[PDB]
């Protein structure tokens, strides 16, 4: 349930989300509903190691 | 539909098929012997004192009368009910050991011998226990149930009766059980809380002792003295078998009761209680939880009587003052004693326990009643107060063993059979009293400067060896069980013994109001009294299978 | 608020009863070893009078405790505190809808130290797609709630504790008995000890399903559900010493952990059918159910600081425990229903299921279940259409069964437990199998082994409850008038009754059993009238009433004799109501020597002491005097809803009412004696304080006396009261303003109203108690008075 | 020959609680995003166990620490955290050129 | 509104992973775009052999 990954590497552009944010911050972000859809999605996999 | 509802199964058990495989056969005789440590409580002890209360040896203690109200309806002898719950209590706890032991029974009958080499040793000790209890029930309530078939079923025991039995051939089926044991145990037991094949001795006379003042009428009056039951108690007390175990009488009095001397030469068999053993609080004794006087906060049950008090008394030569006792109390300066009064009864202004920290009064520190059960504390189970064998759980409680033979008994116990049966081996019965009552005599140590400090004239001195008649040695022996075993909770069954409840009680009723006012009222009916009534519930649910005793109504 | 609240004697009072019961017996009242002294005499017929009377100021020599008149009760309770928050918001589109709530409730009990509180979040949703015939669906909830419970016995306690003992002890300790001072330990420090054995509880409760409708009147839905909760807590042993009550100087802490999961699986397959006249339901499914337990805790001993901060089991220095084991069921189920309805005025119904348990062996694992009814929706027959007056009236008959297997997992099994004897036990009889085999006293691990807790039964199967019912729904007046009846017969057979051993049998000898049957048959009523005024009232009364009989058919020999279910074990319940109970007979009191002499012979009888009747007749008053005193069934319960509307106020009221049921009081044992107790000096009921004397010769309470001679704790009529009862449950008030006025606020709804539940309580005049509904010693039923409010957007 | 069985558990809890304000505005060929705000936290976390020895059966459902005989001991320790702050933020265009 | 399932048997024996899922998210706006009440939660399960 992924939408988008940012991954904020620098020091200048993830100072705001914190002190704690030192060895850099990787914002993650789920999905929503879109205007007017009504989709529906269903996967799967069967693999061998 | 079928997988699904047999996944789930009991967790933490094990289950009656497996119980009997012959890994668990050694776990269910040691839970067999922790029963007679875990299933007494504070008003059921397998010491059988809350009954003993009965006896002219002792009060019931507490706050007053109501504080255990059935006990005191058994200590005056009156308003006793068949529906009562401690009657119901006991006779259920005491067939509860006796499962334990058929359990056991049950899988060792099945064990190989060749496999297995302690097989019948084994299943010796369990007989024994089962012995033990069946015993315990005999003297409590008389018309009892016989349960010795380990094999029965659990329906079978529906159809069990208190009567599919005589009398007599009730008490040769616990003489039975001891008798096997005889047979099998061995001679010494390293781990000693398992019973010596002396213990099993002793216990198989104590049973033809009571066996032998035959109750084969209706009622409960004597119906003559058997001897071939009497040359058995002295078959099983022979000192030789007793020297084949190492037992004896130690040298002073006072270790037979104290921590320190547990599993000496005199303690036949007893209930090993622990400490620091892994339970919760420890094995410790609680079915005595009551019995320690008021300096620990509660409860001050099992306290001696002033007539028991008075018996120590001796008179200028050191011998019991037979017919005077009673008529003046016990006064320090001027009367002599025996100095086991010392080791029974902790008396005010006297030492607790050989403590001369914790001098005893007549206070609310020591005594619970305001003076209605007097002011005496029971020695023999108590402890220092400083001992690390004592510990409060819910009551106060130590480790102190119970020991159940003493090996005074077995000498005493002699001496009994060879009095009554009358055959010249009288004045070898006096010459057993005299061994107990000059080890006695001499059990000066812990209060050896009692004389100094206190005034007290210690003065005993045993019996010549004279040609005693029958009548006046059965009275030195019963002084000398007097003295010996007070408050071990068999004064009363030595009464029934003898067929004299009735008149030693009914007696000691009218002397003792003087000085406990509960006995007011007190009256006990012979050919009733001398037995607990077999419980009102127990019989309901026998299907009329069950017979109460005699003197009790159709209820 | 606490309301009901138990009289019970003050220390002055105390003292004048205990100066009646001495002197009853004719003992020196002034020999009581507490600090009361007596100035008394005899009046001019002889009897005893008390003129003065003095308390010393401390209970003990050495003045550590002194002499109050506390009221146990008021220091027990407090003003209790609700609160209750909720929001809860929905939308609804073509394709879906959506729910979404949270709540928040507190309670503050009116017994100290004894609150509850939860905290609620509930999603559902579902979604139509391709052309709504692919549906899926969800409903969840999510719950967190917490709690520190009352004591078990406190009410007793403080019922016990007498008033003469201070709640502080002059060094600020908690008071407590000294001297001749009762048994009983401080209550309020009861309380206060356990104020930190908060337990935890999380619960997630939901499901997911699907449904498919691959043409029109054919659905197929499967539906999983999930329940899953834990419970942790950590509980305290704090060191106590109330004067005498002490626990030595113990401490410890316990941390429990508990899960409960379980989770159910369906599938449904559904056919619908509409032929011109036929009407007609079929369904058939297949359900799987699972059940897993596990619950664990660590116990340590020996705490250097005495708070929750501290109390960790890591940092005890005494003795460890360690508890727990696991537990499971599953079930599963066949079933089709079929429903059937001809011209909209005659239907039947078809119930069919076969019904597996893990908890049977496979020889007895399923059992098969049907169920049939009928209807006749009479009005739509012709010849009924000459009574304008009745809108419909429809008469149902049914048959059915239904299994039950509600029974221990473990029931099938003989089971050995190893329990070493790691538990606390009371007084002994721990029941372990370890043993000091050696003689050593300790100092180690011991031996040990297993015992027998429950004897196996290979074929236990299902126990059947078979339903017969009767009933008639009606509509008269247009739909003004309207209600049902109902009549039913309903017995269970083969009932699973943990039945006990005889006494050979011994330890564990119990085993699960088919063995009995009991009966229930009874009428059940509704009957409701609504309608308007023509000044502004609108009132709708909706009111019911039932009865019902219970009785045992069969029982195993061993639980008739146990008294299990009934008579006391003395004699057997089959035949009469499930908690049925024997007693004697009591018949007044004896108030003259004369009516001893005259009556049956009767262990401790005397003037003043309750005579017991002489039913066999035998001349002797003994156990075999007893007879059925008490039966737990009403003659007929009720309830009814009044509502009012009258010009934007709305009311409502709701009573309940139960009518014939006897209640066996247990206070009444500590209300009118001074020693049907088990020990000397408690504190006594407040009515005693009228007990029958030759002073007093007008009463119905036994004379005051100092020993129970005449056992009058025995179980007797004299304990059975009239327990019927009439509550206002709630009445509620309420405003909403006029709609033009809070739409403007934007609010299609804004109320705010007022209420007070249990605020009245009518009762017996032989009801000699506070409450009929609970009077003895459970949690008390407050007087709740409320205010709230309701918007809507 | 030594049986034991250990029964852990462990918990952690984190809540967060913040309160963001912003303002947009766009006049002539600049726009600016100003935001403020303050956050919390708080992490409670714990844990404790168990410990049994000497089972007699050896299957993973007869091994719960009841059914055992030996010496017992038991563990436990608890966490804490807390944090509270407050931030800001700006930007600028003015040109569509230099941000 | 997700769910999902997700199993590995590890090569080396006797070691495995399963993953049992769920999300449920929401928003909805009320006046005009001035009030927005919303929500994201989840729900795991693993249980895996070491």
Redesign the interface.
């Given at each position: 349930?992924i939408e988008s990954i940012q991954v904020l590497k620098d020091a200048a552009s993830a100072s705001?989300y914190?002190?704690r944010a030192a060895n850099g911050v990787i914002i993650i972000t789920?999905?929503?509903?879109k205007k007017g859809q009504?989709k529906?999605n269903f996967d799967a996999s069967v693999s061998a190691? | 539909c079928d997988d699904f509802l047999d996944r789930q199964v009991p967790q933490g058990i094990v289950t009656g098929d497996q119980i009997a495989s012959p890994e668990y056969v050694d776990n269910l005789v040691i839970s067999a012997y922790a029963i007679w440590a875990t299933g007494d409580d504070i008003n059921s002890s397998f010491s059988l004192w809350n009954y003993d209360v009965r006896s002219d040896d002792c009060y019931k203690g507490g706050s007053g009368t109501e504080d255990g109200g059935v006990f005191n309806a058994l200590e005056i002898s009156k308003g006793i009910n068949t529906t009562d719950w401690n009657i119901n209590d006991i006779w259920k706890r005491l067939y509860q050991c006796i499962t334990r032991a058929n359990t056991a029974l049950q899988s060792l009958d099945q064990m190989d011998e060749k496999t297995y080499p302690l097989k019948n040793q084994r299943i010796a000790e369990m007989r024994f226990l089962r012995g033990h209890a069946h015993f315990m029930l005999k003297q409590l309530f008389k018309k009892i149930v016989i349960v010795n078939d380990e094999n029965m079923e659990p329906d079978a025991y529906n159809e069990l009766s208190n009567t599919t039995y005589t009398n007599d051939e009730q008490w040769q089926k616990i003489a039975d059980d001891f008798q096997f044991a005889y047979d099998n145990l061995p001679e010494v037991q390293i781990e000693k809380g398992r019973p010596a094949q002396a213990a099993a001795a002793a216990y198989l006379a104590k049973t033809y002792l009571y066996k032998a003042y035959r109750q084969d009428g209706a009622d409960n009056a004597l119906t003559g003295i058997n001897e071939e039951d009497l040359k058995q108690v002295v078959k099983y007390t022979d000192p030789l078998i007793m020297a084949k175990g190492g037992y004896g009488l130690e040298t002073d009095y006072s270790m037979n009761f104290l921590p320190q001397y547990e599993n000496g030469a005199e303690s036949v068999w007893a209930i090993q209680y622990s400490i620091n053993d892994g339970t919760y609080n420890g094995n410790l004794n609680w079915g005595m939880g009551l019995t320690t006087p008021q300096i620990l906060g509660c409860c001050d049950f099992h306290k001696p009587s002033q007539n028991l008090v008075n018996a120590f008394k001796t008179d200028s030569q050191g011998k019991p003052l037979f017919s005077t006792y009673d008529n003046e109390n016990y006064e320090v300066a001027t009367d002599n004693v025996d100095p086991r009064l010392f080791h029974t009864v902790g008396m005010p202004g006297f030492p607790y326990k050989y403590n001369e920290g914790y001098i005893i009064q007549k206070n609310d520190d020591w005594s619970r009643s305001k003076g209605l059960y007097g002011y005496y504390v029971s020695l023999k189970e108590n402890v220092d107060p400083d001992c690390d064998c004592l510990k409060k759980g819910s009551y106060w409680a130590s480790s102190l063993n119970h020991i159940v033979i003493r090996y005074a008994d077995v000498l005493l116990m002699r001496a009994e059979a060879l009095i009554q049966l009358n055959d010249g081996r009288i004045t070898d019965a006096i010459s057993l009293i005299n061994e107990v009552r000059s080890r006695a005599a001499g059990s000066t140590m812990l209060i050896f400067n009692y004389k100094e400090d206190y005034g007290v004239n210690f003065k005993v001195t045993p019996y010549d060896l004279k040609a005693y008649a029958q009548d006046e040695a059965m009275k030195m022996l019963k002084w000398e069980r007097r003295v010996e075993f007070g408050m071990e909770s068999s004064r009363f069954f030595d009464l029934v013994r003898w067929g004299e409840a009735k008149d030693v009680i009914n007696a000691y009723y009218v002397t003792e109001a003087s000085r406990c006012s509960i006995y007011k009222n007190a009256g006990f009916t012979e050919n009733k009294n001398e037995y607990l009534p077999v419980p009102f519930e127990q019989i309901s649910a026998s299907n009329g299978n069950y017979t109460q005793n005699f003197g009790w109504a159709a209820a | 608020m606490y309301q009901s609240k138990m009289n019970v004697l003050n220390t002055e009072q105390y003292g004048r009863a205990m100066w009646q019961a001495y002197v009853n017996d004719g003992e020196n009242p002034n020999g009581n070893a507490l600090g009361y002294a007596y100035n008394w005499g005899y009046n001019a017929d002889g009897n005893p009078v008390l003129y003065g009377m003095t308390l010393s100021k401390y209970l003990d020599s050495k003045n550590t405790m002194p002499v109050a008149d506390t009221d146990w009760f008021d220091e027990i309770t407090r003003t209790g505190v609700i609160q209750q928050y909720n929001l809860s918001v929905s939308n609804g589109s073509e394709?879906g809808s959506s729910f979404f709530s949270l709540g928040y409730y507190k309670n503050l009990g009116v017994i100290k130290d004894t609150d509850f509180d939860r905290f609620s979040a509930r999603m559902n949703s579902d979604?139509?797609?391709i052309d709504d015939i692919?549906t899926?669906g969800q409903h969840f909830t999510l719950n967190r709630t917490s709690e520190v419970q009352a004591p078990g016995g406190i009410i007793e306690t403080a019922l016990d504790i007498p008033s003469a003992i201070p709640v502080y002890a002059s060094d600020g300790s908690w008071g407590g008995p000294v001297g001749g001072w009762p048994d009983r330990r401080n209550p309020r420090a009861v309380l206060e000890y356990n104020k930190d054995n908060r337990y935890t509880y999380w619960r997630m409760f939901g499901d997911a399903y699907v449904n498919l409708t691959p043409f029109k009147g054919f659905n197929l839905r499967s539906t999983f559900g999930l329940d899953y909760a834990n419970k942790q807590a950590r509980y305290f042993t704090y060191p106590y010493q109330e004067g005498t009550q002490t626990n030595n100087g113990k401490s410890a802490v316990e941390a429990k952990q508990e899960h409960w999961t379980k989770w159910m699986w369906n599938a449904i397959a559904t056919y619908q059918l509409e032929v011109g006249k036929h009407r007609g339901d079929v369904m058939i499914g297949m359900e799987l159910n699972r059940e897993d337990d596990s619950h664990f805790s660590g116990y340590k001993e020996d705490f250097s600081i005495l708070t929750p901060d501290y109390m960790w089991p890591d940092a005890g220095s005494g003795t460890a425990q360690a508890y727990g084991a696991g537990e499971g069921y599953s079930l599963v189920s066949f079933f089709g229903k079929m429903n059937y309805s001809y011209a909209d005025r005659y239907l039947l119904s078809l119930t069919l299921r076969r019904d597996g348990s893990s908890r049977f062996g496979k020889n007895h694992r399923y059992a098969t279940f049907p169920s049939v009814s009928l209807g006749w929706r009479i009005t739509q027959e012709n010849f009924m259409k000459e009574l304008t007056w009745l809108d419909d009236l429809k008469l149902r008959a049914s048959w059915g069964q239904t299994g039950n297997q509600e029974i221990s997992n473990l029931a099938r099994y003989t089971i050995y437990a190893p329990n070493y004897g790691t538990t606390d036990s009371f007084g002994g009889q721990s029941y372990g199998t370890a043993y000091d085999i050696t003689g050593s006293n300790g100092g180690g691990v011991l031996p040990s082994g297993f015992k027998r807790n429950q004897i196996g039964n290979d074929n236990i199967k299902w126990e059947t409850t078979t339903q017969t019912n009767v009933g008639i729904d009606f509509s008269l007046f247009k739909q003004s008038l309207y209600g049902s009846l109902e009549y039913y017969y309903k017995k269970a057979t083969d009932i699973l009754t943990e039945m006990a051993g005889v006494g050979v049998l011994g330890e564990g000898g119990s085993r699960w059993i088919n063995s009995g049957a009991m009966k229930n048959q009874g009428f059940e009523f509704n009957l409701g009238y609504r309608n308007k005024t023509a000044f502004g009232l609108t009132y709708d009364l909706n009111g019911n009433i039932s009865t019902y009989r219970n009785e045992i058919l069969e029982l195993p020999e061993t639980v008739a004799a146990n008294g299990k279910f009934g008579g006391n074990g003395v004699k057997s319940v089959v035949g009469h109501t499930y908690g049925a109970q024997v007693g004697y007979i009591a018949d007044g009191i004896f108030k003259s020597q004369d009516e001893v002499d005259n009556h049956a012979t009767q262990e401790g009888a005397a003037v003043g002491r309750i005579r017991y009747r002489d039913i066999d007749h035998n001349g002797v008053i003994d156990e075999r005097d007893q007879n059925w005193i008490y039966d737990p069934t009403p003659s007929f319960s009720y309830g009814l809803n009044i509502y009012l509307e009258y010009k934007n106020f709305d009311l409502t009221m709701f009573w309940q009412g139960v009518q014939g049921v006897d209640i066996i009081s247990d206070v009444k044992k500590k209300s009118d004696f001074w020693s049907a107790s088990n020990v000397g000096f408690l504190n006594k009921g407040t009515r005693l304080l009228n007990a029958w004397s030759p002073t007093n010769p007008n009463s119905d309470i036994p004379a005051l006396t100092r020993s129970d001679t005449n056992n009058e704790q025995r179980v007797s009529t004299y304990f059975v009261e009239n327990g019927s009862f009439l509550k206002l449950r709630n009445i509620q008030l309420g405003y909403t303003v006029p709609a033009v006025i809070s739409k403007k606020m934007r609010m299609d709804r804004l109320r705010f109203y007022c209420s007070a539940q249990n605020l009245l309580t009518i009762k017996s005049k032989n009801f000699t108690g506070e409450d009929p509904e609970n009077p003895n010693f459970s949690y008390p039923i407050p007087v709740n008075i409320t205010f709230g409010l309701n918007i809507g957007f």
């Open positions: 349930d705001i914190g002190s789920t999905k929503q509903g009504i529906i190691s | - | 394709k979604y139509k797609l692919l899926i």
